[PDB]
Amino acid sequence: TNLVTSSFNLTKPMKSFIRRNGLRVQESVTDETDFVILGSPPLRRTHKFLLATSLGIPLVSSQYLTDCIKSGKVLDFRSYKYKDEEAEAKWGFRLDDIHRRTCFNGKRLYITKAIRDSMVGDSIHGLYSILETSGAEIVGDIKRAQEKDTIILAQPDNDQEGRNMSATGLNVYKIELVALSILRDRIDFDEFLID
């Protein structure tokens, strides 16, 4: 059984239990991941969380591992499904909606230069990773993006490519489209339209 941790630091005893009970920690979420252990609420909307959600992988409370240790056995992770009603109301989604997302399957997306430059580090890496794992293709250049079959993600202000596309008649959208769409398994385009 394969697991990933997000916003949670594993202790040495936890790693010992894992080593001995035929569990394995992974560096990244993949289609072979069985569940993701999340740090205590409030839920943090990390790359790993969004990948797990996109791929239909259950989210599990950290308490699971401690309780496993206390019982000596691998408990059922299902007793420990992650719960956070506040996040559910805040972002408008269900944690019990555990299934592979299809909303980005076959979609073409373009992320403006402003976004690519202005998210140095993990943020944009998680963006590209989530999109391609979710079945989307990133178009090769802004010219190809200037088509109605492409979702253009831009910054609402201070985005020259964004404004230039708007001035063609093309709609451009805020980056949040990606995360919330994954959470909802639906793209609510109007919510994220920049104008």
Binding site: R44, R45, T46, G126, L127, I175
Partner: peptide, 6 residues
């Protein structure tokens, strides 16, 4: 360093 949120 902390896992970034999107």
């Amino acid at each position: 360093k902390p896992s970034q949120e999107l």
